Amino acid sequence: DKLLLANWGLPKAVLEKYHSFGVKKMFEWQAECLLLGQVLEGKNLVYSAPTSAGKTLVAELLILKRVLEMRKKALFILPFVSVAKEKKYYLQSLFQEVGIKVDGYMGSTSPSRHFSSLDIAVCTIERANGLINRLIEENKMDLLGMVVVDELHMLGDSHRGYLLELLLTKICYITRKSASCSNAVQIVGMSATLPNLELVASWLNAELYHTDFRPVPLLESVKVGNSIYDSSMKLVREFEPMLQVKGDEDHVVSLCYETICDNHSVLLFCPSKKWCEKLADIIAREFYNLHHQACPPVILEQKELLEVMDQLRRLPSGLDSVLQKTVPWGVAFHHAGLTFEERDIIEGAFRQGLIRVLAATSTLSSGVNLPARRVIIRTPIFGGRPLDILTYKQMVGRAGRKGVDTVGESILICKNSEKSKGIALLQGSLKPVRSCLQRREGEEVTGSMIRAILEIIVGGVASTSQDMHTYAACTFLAASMKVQLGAIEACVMWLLENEFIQSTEAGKVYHPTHLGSATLSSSLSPADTLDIFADLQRAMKGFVLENDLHILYLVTPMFEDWTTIDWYRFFCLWEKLPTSMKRVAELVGVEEGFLARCVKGKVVARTERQHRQMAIHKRFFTSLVLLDLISEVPLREINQKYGCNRGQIQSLQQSAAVYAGMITVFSNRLGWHNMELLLSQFQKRLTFGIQRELCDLVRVSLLNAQRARVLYASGFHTVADLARANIVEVEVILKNANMRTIWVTGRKGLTEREAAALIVEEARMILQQDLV
């Protein structure tokens, strides 16, 4: 039939594991897409299909084709670290039975395997562009055989988008030059069903397969009043509630119960965090009321759900009070205020189906995949704005649990004044994807183009204006416009007038400075790099070594609305603040004559010096949070003192750990060797949130800060000690912190016996690799 994979002749290892996953047969569209033509022979490829359509199986089989036959290496580029982690573990399981070696470059993580050892690198767009810049420096690029891009529709919509354009255009510019002046580097792109996907394929010189095939039919609708309208706005049903809900009038609660009785999950998107908490509370209390008054009441796997609650309660943040009542009933909320492990457990319980209503903010839609039968979206308005059509289609695209459901369903709930927006979301379609490099004429030229011109010149490609114009023709801006060359000449002038590059007579040839090479190696933005360089020179002339705060002042990202800074707390903290830390404050320019003003009331903040002073204050306040965070003050206690949420601290912690890496490599390339000593410790130390004491022990990835804390406190101060310890000892010490209540991000929950064995065995593995 050529559809049972055995006909294709895959390695038996992957065949059996796909059968364990369930992929005994590929869909006709996947078979055609691999057959399509020069695709199978190495031509670039772009394809789009619904997320349910088996989207990634095509790229996975092309990776095997290249990696086994060519024995060259592949990149996998993913939009988010949560996706990147999950895909790394999936690919490891399948390929490790082959013996193909997989590890990833994600967030502040770096692999223990050096890239020479790897076959496949799974990475976030930011780390992907950083890798390619290193591959240009080494001139290693010949090593790459494939570059797979997910969420290629990001190309226009974010700061991550322009990095994807600057990434792909360097590979195009270098490869086509080397080829023109079989396909060595193949691109496989996956995207949303963009209008101008024909253009993206033609720009990449890809082959294109667009399909809207889904494994389960999707039924959309909108609900307004009691009426449920099909997308064509014919009435398909008139709703009348099975459940006499008291909590709210939109029937959102009774519209969930309608399918829960059919034993299927609901997923429910809410405009905001506190709304998601309040609505998840109401649904759980109506589940309890029905059961307490008692179609049947809900049937719940309560032994499984208490195992889920135990896995939550052992987290550093414990079990949230709202989750405590809602989770045993089988309702849960998921929003940016939850910690990463806490979300992952809620997500994992929903995939199994132990949770049956999950409410979420829209961030779940673009993130990790969950199948849900009934997807309810409460309003066409989110955050005080119309919902974006990309987000709506990423939400509804989840509907229908493939192979379990006969059909998927979605109900957009809407009011009369909003109905016009609800209709528009159903019938509308995405904007064409559009290069971010288009000149914003109120500036000199867009910072993404200045980065672009920096990356080539400092890279040592297109050292001359004719080559920069040739790279311009590869740029997707050119294919989208097919002013650009005038914008490029302005970028060169800006870089030259800000001493990132030197101009010399031969036309002209442009050379990097140390400041240029440090900017490219760090991956910092160059406009930011001026103030980073100015602040580092201001600090190195009068540094405070008696504490961690001044180092953290340089490491902390600038204020990016990551929380509302409660000035009353800040002025209260300021009086208590130690005089040693007040010395750090007045060195960097914090002044209480202005901090008293912010607690007295809103500052007008309409002038650049008040803007920078406010940024000084707001950067200082953020640096105090990081000082408490790396002293192992629990997340619950930072929240008491500063008032920010658990998820705000963790997202600040992850981004600050990335910025600590940038500042370290920036200072190294400049040659501030003293600063490299101090700051290099802080990337790992911020990433896990630990004292200096633990930084060696945390190398075992099965150990978080708290598990490292107890193994350290027991006396296993080094990986050698932890490898010498008996498994029974680690078990007692882990229990000192016969059922699965340890969470490990790459795994389901471990028992203490199983975790302790793998901890000892990983420590022995680390020593084998470290000594070798």
Add this chain to the structure above:
Amino acid sequence: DKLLLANWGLPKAVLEKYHSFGVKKMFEWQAECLLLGQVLEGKNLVYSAPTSAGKTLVAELLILKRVLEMRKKALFILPFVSVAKEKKYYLQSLFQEVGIKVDGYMGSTSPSRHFSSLDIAVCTIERANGLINRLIEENKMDLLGMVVVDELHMLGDSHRGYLLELLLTKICYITRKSASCSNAVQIVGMSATLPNLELVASWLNAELYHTDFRPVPLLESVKVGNSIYDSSMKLVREFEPMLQVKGDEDHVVSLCYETICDNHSVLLFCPSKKWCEKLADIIAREFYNLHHQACPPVILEQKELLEVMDQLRRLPSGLDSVLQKTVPWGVAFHHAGLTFEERDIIEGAFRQGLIRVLAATSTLSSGVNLPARRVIIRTPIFGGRPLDILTYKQMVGRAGRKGVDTVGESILICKNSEKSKGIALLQGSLKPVRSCLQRREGEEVTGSMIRAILEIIVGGVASTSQDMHTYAACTFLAASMKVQLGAIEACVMWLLENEFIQSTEAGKVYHPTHLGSATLSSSLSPADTLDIFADLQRAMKGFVLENDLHILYLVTPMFEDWTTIDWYRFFCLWEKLPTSMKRVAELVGVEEGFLARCVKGKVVARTERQHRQMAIHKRFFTSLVLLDLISEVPLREINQKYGCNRGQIQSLQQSAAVYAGMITVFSNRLGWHNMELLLSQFQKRLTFGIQRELCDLVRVSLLNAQRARVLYASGFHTVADLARANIVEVEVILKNANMRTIWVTGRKGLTEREAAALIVEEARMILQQDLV
């Protein structure tokens, strides 16, 4: 007879090597000294013999006895690093065929083996006391089986003298306390012919053997005018010069020539460095004039002396212009201005006898064993003072080449007005040794006693006044007085009032602070520790990271007359000094108005304000020298810019590398973890004198800074790559940097091929031990 070592029944591996060293038969006094009684069964021993006796053979046979039968470890304590290096390589060469493991602790040297893996530790006094303090902290002391002390006469007078008393008293106090409430630790003490040696033996509970047996009879006389007088002032000979002179009237050149008429060699001691240069020059001119005008002229085998000159000229210092003319005629000078490798090569050539007249300052006489046949001493008046009788007897004690001569001779040259002093030195005898612990009139307490009470209390022995009085009874001050207890209670009060210890109610019990534990663990002086701790807090509140200078300002030893500071140079440098370095100057407290004053005229500091102000200036000036030395500015260029001699920089460099270790460990115990990062690199960088990148490579002991520079510059950036290296490539590099012209301190000179092979083999050995 059975004085043949084969009758004693030593291990053949040492017996054969002693035969290779000519030690086929022990002297009768050595046989008796080992037989003497309970000495052979583990009783403490003190013994005294002339330096040219077989003095160390007794201690060497007692070491073998303990380390083979008990398998406990031994210490060997020596007064100077040069002796400690020499003795370590001898003991390695002798014992390593037995499998006994030997290494040592000398200045900033630390062994690659941890102490548990040694059998014998060869230590400078200062590092030996530091070891015993660690052995108390670990409570490892049971591991020791023997402690051998040389130069017990140092106990009386040196600034490193009392440190040997504090060392010996702790071993006595702990051993007697634990044994009373076979001899586990045996002391073997070599000593001068002290008057009160019987007291030292009784204090140490030692057996005693004292002899004046010499292997060659000594002749000893004083010369005034043309008359050579015996010790009784009877005339031994009338003197008339065999060789007429022009340089000086005392016939010193003719008195050398009398033995240069034969194959024997003269060692000549001079009261000053520049006098030694001028007198060695004059002797070489008159040797040349004799050969040029021509008893036979000298026979020199100049093929050997050109190899000696080639081994000098390879050194970073080159060949000194005064050595250049003098060395080929077989004359050499030796003084504290020479580089350490220059001294070692000049010493080595004199032992072989290629150099026939060596002129030296007094430092050689105490420093290292050289056989010399006639020893001439040029005045009773060294440095404007009469010689110390210890120094004279050390100078004369060298006379007579064992087994070569029938007699040794020494002549003291003396003028008519001096003659009374010359005879006084010739007839007189050493002072009895004394504790150097009694406080003088107007002192509160001695710093040695404060250190004594600190070391016990913070060590955790004698936490109470009755035990401090019991340790007092062990102190040699008690045996010499047999006020001390009143001085102890004043020391406890001083420590308690300066917060080194805490007082608590039970009598009383005294506890260490962090400051106490840090000052003990660093081995700093406590009075110095106050100003060190005050300066570290003042620096950590306003540090300069943009250069190495501020770190060096904390690391540089306090000014110790190591140079005459040319203030005119200092003011000339100050105007040129970069504004960044001037910022370091203004932070630490340097004032240009006072610096112009020192050029304007001699400044005498009359008050404590001016003493520390001047000390700030002098400490700053010294810190600039270390900054240029750490840049690898060649010693010649430092000498040009700052004025000081090679030997002053190197002795400053060694002492600063010790002090860098003290401040690193001091900052660790206080918990200034940022200061650990900066300062810890500087101990190695100061020791070898290297930029940061070389710090990994120089740990291969055959590799100096210049050899590391050329290997690094070639690309062998790591010891792994140096283990990978092809030996022929190292040969080509070192030749690029035929004959024996490399110098290695533990060896004779090496061929380029032999050094290259051992460099690679050491790198492989380093990897094996490091991985294991």
